[PDB]
Design a protein around this ligand. Sequence first.
Ligand code: HEM
Length: 153
Amino acid sequence: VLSEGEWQLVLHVWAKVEADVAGHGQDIHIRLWKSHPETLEKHDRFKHLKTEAEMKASEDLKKHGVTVLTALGAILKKKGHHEAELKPLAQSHATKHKIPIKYLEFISEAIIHVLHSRHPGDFGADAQGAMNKALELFRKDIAAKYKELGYQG
Ligand code: HEM
């Protein structure tokens, strides 16, 4: 569990994300796919995007990033009290999309990279550690739900 101070650092940087959710979501996807191209294979639509400029020009991808960050933001704002929000996400990611926990590690890395790239003055070592803990809690709780659903992930 995170301390109150750690949650405040998480939500402080999250407020910066909320100034441009769409742009952050695009950058996170592009960073994830560049670092781990196998993840781009899970999007039947997005996997045919060939260049960074094509990725930025995709309204579908931009909309998807807002959907992703809206879901993650709603979870983070619960400060760990997120079972109701997390359960449907685990259901779809385990049973329909088949997303292994390691891919959630990859997107967590991309999130931290983009947040530090855009907001270094609000995302130093302490805030990075807090965000790392919050995303680790998210992944640990998702992994438990995966197992409950019969998916080892
Ligand atoms: C922070 C982690 C993530 C969050 C909050 C998140 C959230 C979402 C949401 C809200 C949706 C739409 C509703 C649904 O189907 O559940 C979605 C769909 C989907 N997600 Fe994720 N997701 C995450 C990570 C990933 C990763 C790492 C992958 C693949 C490597 C992935 C693959 C997909 C796919 C294939 C879909 C359905 C196709 C689409 O709607 O674009 N997700 N995700």
